[PDB]
Amino acid sequence: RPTFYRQELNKTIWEVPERYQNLSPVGSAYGSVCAAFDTKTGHRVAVKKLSRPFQSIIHAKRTYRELRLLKHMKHENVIGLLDVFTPARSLEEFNDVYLVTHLMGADLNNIVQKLTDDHVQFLIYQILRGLKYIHSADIIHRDLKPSNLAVNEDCELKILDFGLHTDDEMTGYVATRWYRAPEIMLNWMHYNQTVDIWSVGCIMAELLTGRTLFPGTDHIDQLKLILRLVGTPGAELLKKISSESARNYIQSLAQMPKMNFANVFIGANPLAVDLLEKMLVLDSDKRITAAQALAHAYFAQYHDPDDEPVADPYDQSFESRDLLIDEWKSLTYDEVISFVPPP
């Protein structure tokens, strides 16, 4: 057990191992974050103190979920866990959880500058490489958007902030909804990992044009922007929408054909246009997958099928389990004390 030291930073008490130095507050509903220098590894790191991690069954399960997911992710294009600690010496006094990751500077917003087509190729390639890994473990990110993509000086990219959002957060003219697939925006059906590919299409379009693809002022305005581009659904997709009310609403709209994407994305690489047509498909069954997209000719200069790894299997059976707060807390404690740091 390392030696811990205490200090008060912006009205909260932080108790952390001596290896973490020069703590400086950076941000704050799920917890507070400080930047620090890790004297053991030489990295600049982000230290997150969870706020009220075991206040309810829902909150305790969410704490366990986040720790399990972060401990599993080991990929160049996905955020990983450098450390996790608690100052508690036993389960009986266990109350606080701290998570440590590489400190990230800019996100794709702070670049979306002047992007060449070669820049778009490299950025989208890295997102898809990370997504092939995530999806191979049957994990769905569910919240991909430019603010959840970190980029460094050399245009190297990491996916962060997995979906672990409320009604107010998704209301109105808000970027929190502009990248969401329509079947999850409107609860049409049970969704799957194809929702993340819709988000990648929205992001790629924005990198090519400098503009949000579907900046709707509310759910219905956004749906109208989507259907004007990709066309209204045919009977085949309509059969798959489980809400009779949502089906009824869609059929009240006048039918529209899919637009010509070469006349929307004027002057773009024809191979980029082709890939966008394969991502932005209304029927999620028919979208290109991450593994298929990596083999698309648009990425010819970066694709290497010997260097696009998959994940170890991931057991999510806890998600259907019903437990008491203290049982979720004990499972979290075991995962804290069994953590093994990366090489």
Ligand X SMILES: C[C@@]1(C(=O)NCc2ccccc2)CN(C2COC2)CCN1
x/- letters, 242..261, toward Cl ion (CB under 5 A): ------------xx------
Give the span between the Cα atoms of 277 and 255, in whole angstroms: 19
Cα–Cα distances in Å, from 34 out to 20, 75, 102, 151? 11, 24, 12, 20
For Mg ion, the binding residue among 148, 193, 194, 332 (CB under 5 A) is 148
x/- letters, 147..186, toward ligand X (CB under 6 A): ----------------------------------------
Q: Is 115 in the site for ligand X (CB under 6 A)?
A: no
DSSP string, 171-182: SSS-HHHHTS-H
Give the span between the Cα atoms of 164 and 133, in whole angstroms: 18
Q: Is 213 in the site for ligand X (CB under 6 A)?
A: yes
Residue 29 binds which of ligand X, Cl ion, Mg ion, none (CB < 5-8 A, kind-dependent): none
Dump strand ranges (E) for the chain. Answer: 4-9, 12-17, 20-27, 31-38, 44-50, 83-85, 98-102, 106-107, 149-151, 157-159
Q: Tell me how many residues contact ligand X (CB under 6 A).
A: 10
* Catalytic one of 161, 221, 274, 283: 161
Q: Is 29 assigned to a binding site?
A: yes
Q: Is 199 in the site for Mg ion (CB under 5 A)?
A: no
For ligand X, the binding residue among 12, 51, 209, 232 (CB under 6 A) is 209
Nearest to 111 by CA among 122, 101, 97: 122
49, 12 Cβ separation under 8 angstroms:
yes
Nearer to Mg ion by Cβ, of 148 and 194: the residue is 148
Q: Is 32 assigned to a binding site?
A: yes
Q: Is 31 assigned to a binding site?
A: yes
Q: Is 101 in the site for Mg ion (CB under 5 A)?
A: no
Nearer to Cl ion by Cβ, of 145 and 287: the residue is 145
140: which 2 tokens?
Answer: 């769905």
Count of residues making up the chain = 343
Give the span between the Cα atoms of 157 and 203, in whole angstroms: 14
Q: Is 154 a catalytic residue?
A: no
Contact residues for Mg ion (CB under 5 A)? 148, 161
Contact residues for ligand X (CB under 6 A)? 205, 208-209, 211, 213, 264-268
Catalytic annotation, residues: 161
